[PDB]
Amino acid sequence: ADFDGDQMAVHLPLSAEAQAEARILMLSSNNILKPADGRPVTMPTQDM
DNA sequence: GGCGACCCGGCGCCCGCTACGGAGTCAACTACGGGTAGGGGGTATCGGGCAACGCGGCACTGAACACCGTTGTCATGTGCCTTG
Numbered sequence A: 001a002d003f004d005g006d007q008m009a010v011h012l013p014l015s016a017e018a019q020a021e022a023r024i025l026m027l028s029s030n031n032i033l034k035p036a037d038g039r040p041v042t043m044p045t046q047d048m
Numbered sequence B: 001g002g003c004g005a006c007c008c009g010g011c012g013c014c015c016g017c018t019a020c021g022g023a024g025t026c027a028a029c030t031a032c033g034g035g036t037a038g039g040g041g042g043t044a045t046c047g048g049g050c051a052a053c054g055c056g057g058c059a060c061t062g063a064a065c066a067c068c069g070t071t072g073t074c075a076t077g078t079g080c081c082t083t084g
């Protein structure tokens, strides 16, 4: 997702189970490593 | 005469979402006959508006008895005086 111009859908987990999964499984901070080859993907390089 | 290419048909698909324009189009006819449906007309049936009149507590009716309280009342008992 570059910032040239891009829209991103936002979805709402409703049930207690859904927000539980989103809190535990689908969290942004528990997916540092890319599943393709198990290397970091959450440290981009453009500016920092 | 099954192999064989080849030929052909015939089919199967062809990243993701939002968000983003409108446009809308060429050749019968009449007669009948019914039946439904509308309209108003009139009619039986259901629904809305009022004071007595159901109640009840108690209250008055005190009236007529009852419940103590009272000073009415009586015939009948002590104390002093007179005579045996």
Ligand SMILES: [Mg+2]
Residues within 6 Å of the ligand: A001, A002, A003, A004, A005, A006
């Ligand atoms: Mg982009």
